[PDB]
Design a protein around this ligand. Structure first.
Ligand SMILES: [Mg+2]
Length: 134
RNA sequence: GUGAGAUUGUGAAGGGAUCUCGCAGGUAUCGUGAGGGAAGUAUGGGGUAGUACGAGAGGAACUCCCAUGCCGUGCCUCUAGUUUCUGGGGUU
């Protein structure tokens, strides 16, 4: 009940099972999409994520201080091409996420690469620490 | 009444009677709408508002906009997929 009807429709990229990068410097190196917040159910359909979506994750490779637990990440990059409303189709080289709180605070201090305009606008802690808002 | 046929079990040319139905519709377009089917359904955000209420802790809602999930009917401008146009090229 936080972010769903706030940004436009984006082509979903990362279903449950996906293993994305951690651009956050929380010591982790890896996420694993466990589910997606905002998934109203459809039979046989997986929870899939897009740029602005908060996911439920677990670190599969990183510090054991936060590895075997269910965390909250926010997607910032995806390889799946999404069409913006100004008619431009755009995509990243890699998928990445950044771990957050249940309320959205970034839990680290810096992002590796860029972030999108789609995920920075929903999350002001993500738009602050990002070196380039794509 | 008027046209058209048939009376095919024992040879042939004749022409009598009788039965069967044909005697008005065909073609083309625009509509009617009985009856039957039947569909859209949910959500979050904005502000209202940190207001109502309350000792405080806490903490609403409608109009009104903005989006979105599931579904439905299509579509191919874009992007993506597909190539037996074996199209052009490359290579063993
Ligand atoms: Mg009716």
């Amino acid at each position: 009940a936080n972010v769903k009807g706030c940004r436009f429709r984006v082509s979903v990229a990362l279903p449950v099972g996906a293993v994305v990068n951690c651009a956050d410097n929380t010591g982790a190196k890896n996420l694993y999409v466990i589910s997606v917040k905002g998934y109203h159910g459809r039979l046989n359909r997986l929870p899939s994520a897009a740029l602005g979506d908060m996911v439920m994750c677990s670190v599969k490779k990183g510090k054991p201080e936060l590895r075997k637990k269910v965390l909250n990440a926010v997607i910032i990059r995806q390889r799946k091409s999404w069409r913006r409303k100004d008619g431009t189709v755009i995509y990243f080289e890699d998928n990445a996420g950044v771990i957050v709180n249940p309320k959205g605070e970034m839990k680290g201090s810096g992002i590796a690469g860029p972030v999108a305009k789609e995920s920075a606008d929903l999350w002001p802690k993500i738009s602050t620490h990002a070196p380039a808002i794509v």
